[PDB]
Design an enzyme around this catalytic site. Structure first.
Site, PDB file in Angstrom:
ATOM      1  N   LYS A 218      58.550  47.656  33.427  1.00  0.00           N
ATOM      2  CA  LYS A 218      57.113  47.446  33.520  1.00  0.00           C
ATOM      3  C   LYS A 218      56.390  48.779  33.747  1.00  0.00           C
ATOM      4  CE  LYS A 218      53.549  45.527  36.503  1.00  0.00           C
ATOM      5  NZ  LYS A 218      53.306  44.765  37.758  1.00  0.00           N
ATOM      6  N   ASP A 223      47.150  49.721  37.976  1.00  0.00           N
ATOM      7  CA  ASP A 223      46.829  48.312  38.194  1.00  0.00           C
ATOM      8  C   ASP A 223      45.670  48.143  39.173  1.00  0.00           C
ATOM      9  OD1 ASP A 223      46.849  45.557  38.222  1.00  0.00           O
ATOM     10  OD2 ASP A 223      48.803  45.366  39.227  1.00  0.00           O
ATOM     11  N   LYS A 230      41.307  44.075  42.760  1.00  0.00           N
ATOM     12  CA  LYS A 230      41.948  44.266  44.050  1.00  0.00           C
ATOM     13  C   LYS A 230      40.886  44.609  45.089  1.00  0.00           C
ATOM     14  CE  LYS A 230      46.435  45.689  42.272  1.00  0.00           C
ATOM     15  NZ  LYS A 230      47.275  44.654  42.915  1.00  0.00           N
ATOM     16  N   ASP A 241      52.366  51.291  39.768  1.00  0.00           N
ATOM     17  CA  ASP A 241      52.735  50.026  39.163  1.00  0.00           C
ATOM     18  C   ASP A 241      53.562  50.226  37.876  1.00  0.00           C
ATOM     19  OD1 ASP A 241      52.603  47.240  39.625  1.00  0.00           O
ATOM     20  OD2 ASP A 241      51.006  47.018  38.123  1.00  0.00           O
ATOM     21  N   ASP A 300      45.356  39.771  38.132  1.00  0.00           N
ATOM     22  CA  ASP A 300      46.231  40.676  38.872  1.00  0.00           C
ATOM     23  C   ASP A 300      47.726  40.320  38.807  1.00  0.00           C
ATOM     24  OD1 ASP A 300      46.705  43.028  40.272  1.00  0.00           O
ATOM     25  OD2 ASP A 300      46.038  42.245  42.212  1.00  0.00           O
ATOM     26  N   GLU A 302      49.420  40.477  36.072  1.00  0.00           N
ATOM     27  CA  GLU A 302      49.429  40.949  34.702  1.00  0.00           C
ATOM     28  C   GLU A 302      50.812  41.361  34.231  1.00  0.00           C
ATOM     29  OE1 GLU A 302      48.745  43.043  37.190  1.00  0.00           O
ATOM     30  OE2 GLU A 302      50.162  44.611  36.605  1.00  0.00           O
ATOM     31  N   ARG A 304      53.904  40.176  34.551  1.00  0.00           N
ATOM     32  CA  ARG A 304      54.769  39.145  33.967  1.00  0.00           C
ATOM     33  C   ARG A 304      54.317  38.798  32.537  1.00  0.00           C
ATOM     34  NH1 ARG A 304      53.781  35.105  38.846  1.00  0.00           N
ATOM     35  NH2 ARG A 304      53.483  37.232  39.693  1.00  0.00           N
TER      36      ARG A 304
HETATM   37 MN   LIG Z   1      48.682  43.225  39.405  1.00  0.00          MN
HETATM   38 MN   LIG Z   2      51.020  45.021  38.448  1.00  0.00          MN
END
Ligand SMILES: [Mn+2]
Ligand SMILES: [Mn+2]
Ligand SMILES: [Mn+2]
Ligand SMILES: [Mn+2]
Ligand SMILES: [Mn+2]
Ligand SMILES: [Mn+2]
Lengths: 455, 455, 326
Positions: A218, A223, A230, A241, A300, A302, A304
């Site tokens: 990933k 992020d 957030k 991230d 958030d 995102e 997956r």
């Molecule tokens: Mn996220």
């Molecule tokens: Mn993330």
């Protein structure tokens, strides 16, 4: 004595009167400096604890403590791996001392406006070389994670991987714009759309002449949360991230040095998750590469969604055939509540693969615990609109996220998922061989896992 | 060399090759240990920074760093006060080194389940004795603040003050129950009522044969907030809300050692602020000793209400007459937002008293800044029911609290108010001569203020 | 003199009250150009590539997220009769950026250019008074907006002096914008600015201690402190001096850059002043006026003060410049 010599001492080992008078009791990582016998240089007495309980991690940590106590010296010789009496064989001691020295010296000074030589004393030259290489790969991951997101954008990160691939001899393909669209990575595209920095997708292949393993990382370079922004006033290492992508890239760069007889492909989706007039919306539906659908109930979650299509691509039946897939992702914030800040979560339905990864992590000194793929948590994937949701707004998201990813792994392909959100970034002070900030967590576990798989 | 000798070094001073090889550059508080010349003991080289910029605080901090680096040694001799070249005279160096040594050695181990001698080398024996006494008083305050509230209840705190008064020769009166009721300290009684631990009021007098100064110390032994209960999940050092009382008591215990020619009375209201079926209510009105009224708009602004009646008692025209009044209180949480965690707020309408307190704080190495008694903030004391409120629910509560206290100081009596909520408790790690937790802040400022006032 | 001082104050009131959609950075630059022309003041407006050349990387980075591009304006009062530099924070709309201000809390986000307003207005009054001193105004103008291309938490700005700032909170944007302007205003060079005063609606922490009607004054120079405080007394504007606490510099430390723009600890008002101090060239006397709270009255009118934009600091500045000219 080459400016500084570091001597490993187990409990009960003799030190001079000065070290005793300073309180040296051979506690793991304790360092007391003293003049050498001839008065011309420095000796560090470094604690290894009781011989009967010392592990490779003890040596790794003692080496890190040694390099931290070096002062302004130009050369440092570590004799730590020559301490015997413990159950750790000489080769493992040498490997660990080498790792700890490099990991302990690590600094990230690129954005700030005398040590010239670390030598590891041992006949186990091969083990030293392996340790240095593993640690250097870890430090590469540390740099990538520490890098400000404005420098390490998805396009810039793709360029960096291309350069690293070129050095190592790795085959590399970078996808962007229309070429990216053709691949059908609709999760990546949808998540990445809000940002001014366009997304990228990168495939890396280590393919020596000597099974095919797929690594999925990933790479959300920043992020923010997206429209589900957030909360400001909470601290988040939003630039970190992409730690999963970092771990996969770095592991791949170490393989040519080791000469492992196995084919390994890296799959790296890269994007920013930003709020914007054109950002992915709560309630939107993504149609994935396998034709299944995901409702975006929280922007958030995102990662997956980005990983889903890559897992379909990585595991689909086709040319030459990826025999197993391991994904690495700073995926979930729920895990840390139970497991704490220094332990990753491992998910797999395959018990022998679980054992392979856990044992690899033990050798590497990285903390993982296996969490179950609880069938009764699939009910929390249900959507009133699509085949699944990306967020249940209920407890158990770490497990739910793993089950979500499982949906996209082709039938019969062994798969493991490593959720490393917390241990990928150290927001407390430095300890042992671990600095503040980007840790490079999972790089060494991956290398050790690939070694075992190649045997 | 008496196990360990600590040598002060200004920038440019000579050290051996070993200290240089370890990176000793005489940075303030930097300590590098080495064997003594004869190889039988330990030398600590301790940095004092450039001679031209060194202050008494530099010596105080260097002494604290020395005692921290002592290891398992039985005896420590500090030669720090013999370093000359700076603008700090020998007596001030000796005083500061003595303070720093005691302050740096401080530990609070009472509730946990080899150093036998610290010697300060100097001819300035008088200055050393004064430094030790000031630091010991500070440590007494540290103990009182660190003490669990379940041990240091208002009744137990009153007993402790009685014992300390007896040692020192100080006159002491403890008021409780009906005897307390007679004094008309209705703020104290109302605030304290919710708790199972009944409130106390203690007066301490230092009255040598050789002006009368009144010291008023807020002694809320545990501040839960009352019915306006402090949010759970926020951290508050609720036991530390008696830091003002601690500072006043400790300062009073040091006066007989110094033999200051002035009369000083301590006034200590002691209570717990607890939620309960019988606790003080939002909207209740307290009728104070001067006949004026305060509406309780927030039960967590209890300290000002408790102090009000004591200030009337301390400053009222009467027998022998208190010529000036200084109150010390962990009063307000708003201040810290502007000033940070290590600076107290000083309020007084008297410019010369302001100068006396600020200069005293400079000598003591304690950070204060003066805040104005802004007339336009009195509008925020208005109540729809009583003469004033204890909480405006608006910005500016630190200033409003000072103006609130000012209402109870009899006309023509010089008065100063020290708000020390933040610096009274260190919730970060130890630094210089300051431990984690209770600091004893303001003790030394008070002693220095009383010295100047006696001259 | 009273009419002129009050008229300047009212000009600042208008500028602050103006909806941000009308008073954009480009529109605010145009307005200053028009005011400069009236008064005879020399005016240079920088934009686009011309702005980029100046190396005001804080301004550019903070302003980037918005659809309204940033501006930089210099104003000079230069009568034939010391050179004083005035630096005014002109964030025409402060949403917070990606560290977005919580919805459901009230903020006068359009009022974040009150410092720039005070400096501009003070400069417009000088030709009427005929003060024998040269005064330069330096006005960075930008919007702080969330966007797909907005400044990110963890990003690093490399400033005009080569030093670096890590952006730990996008809502502490003003200090980052002011940094490069303070380097430009105070650097050794042509004709030489002898002292620099900045005015900024900078910090929300101050008000907690000081209340809504008092500004904070920072300076290491005790005589300049006295000059500003006495000027404020004559003007009837409330200031109190806060110390530049050396022990608060530890809260500027960054694991990545030379400093952070936010410690997430108590003491941000003081920390912000120390942050600004880093960019003032050695030996240049400097004062910093933090006026976030008194620049906008969110209670009803009282005495000579209306609801809303107050024009706070205009009269203090005029009085300070008068004393400095004597
Ligand atoms: Mn996220
Ligand atoms: Mn993330
Ligand atoms: Mn309270
Ligand atoms: Mn209290
Ligand atoms: Mn802001
Ligand atoms: Mn702002």
């Amino acid at each position: 004595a080459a400016d500084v010599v570091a001597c490993g001492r187990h409990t009960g080992a003799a030190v001079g009167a000065f070290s005793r008078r300073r309180g040296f009791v051979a506690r793991p990582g304790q360092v007391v400096a003293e003049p050498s016998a001839d008065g011309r240089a420095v000796v560090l007495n470094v604690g290894l604890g009781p011989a009967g309980s010392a592990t490779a991690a003890t040596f790794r940590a003692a080496a890190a403590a040694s390099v931290r106590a070096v002062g302004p010296a130009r050369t440092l010789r570590l004799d730590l791996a020559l301490a015997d009496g413990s159950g750790v064989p000489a080769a493992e001691r040498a490997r660990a001392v080498a790792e700890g020295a490099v990991l302990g010296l690590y600094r990230y000074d690129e954005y700030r406006s005398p040590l010239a030589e670390v030598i590891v004393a041992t006949p186990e030259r091969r083990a030293v070389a392996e340790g240095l290489a593993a640690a250097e790969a870890t430090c590469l991951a540390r740099d990538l994670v520490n890098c400000p997101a404005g420098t390490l954008t998805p396009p810039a990160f793709a360029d960096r991987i291309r350069e690293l691939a070129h050095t190592a001899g790795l085959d590399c393909a970078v996808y962007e714009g229309a070429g990216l669209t053709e691949l059908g990575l609709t999760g990546l595209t949808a998540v990445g759309r809000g940002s001014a920095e366009p997304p990228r997708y990168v495939e890396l292949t280590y393919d020596p002449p000597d099974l095919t393993v797929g690594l999925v990382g990933k790479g959300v370079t920043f992020d923010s949360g997206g429209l589900s922004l957030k909360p400001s006033g909470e601290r988040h290492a939003m630039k970190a991230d992409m730690g999963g992508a970092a771990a996969v890239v770095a592991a791949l760069t170490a393989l040519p040095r080791l000469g492992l007889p196995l084919r390994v492909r890296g799959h790296l989706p890269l994007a920013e998750n930003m709020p914007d007039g054109g950002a992915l919306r709560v309630g939107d539906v993504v149609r994935h590469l396998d034709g299944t659908t995901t409702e975006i109930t929280h922007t958030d979650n995102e990662g997956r969604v980005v990983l889903a299509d890559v897992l379909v691509r990585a595991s689909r039946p086709g040319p030459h055939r990826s025999d197993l897939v391991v994904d690495v992702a700073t995926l979930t914030s729920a895990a840390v509540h139970a497991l704490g800040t220094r332990t990753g979560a491992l998910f797999t339905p395959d018990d022998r693969l679980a054992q392979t990864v856990l044992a690899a992590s033990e050798r590497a000194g990285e903390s993982f615990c296996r969490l179950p793929l609880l069938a009764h948590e699939r009910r929390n994937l249900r959507s009133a609109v699509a085949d699944r949701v990306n967020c249940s707004h209920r407890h158990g998201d770490t497990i739910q996220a793993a089950l979500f990813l499982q949906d996209f792994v082709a039938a019969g392909v062994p798969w493991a998922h490593l959720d490393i959100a917390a241990p990928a970034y150290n927001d407390e002070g430095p300890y042992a061989e671990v600095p503040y900030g980007g840790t490079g967590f999972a790089v060494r576990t991956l290398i050790e896992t690939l070694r075992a798989l190649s045997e």
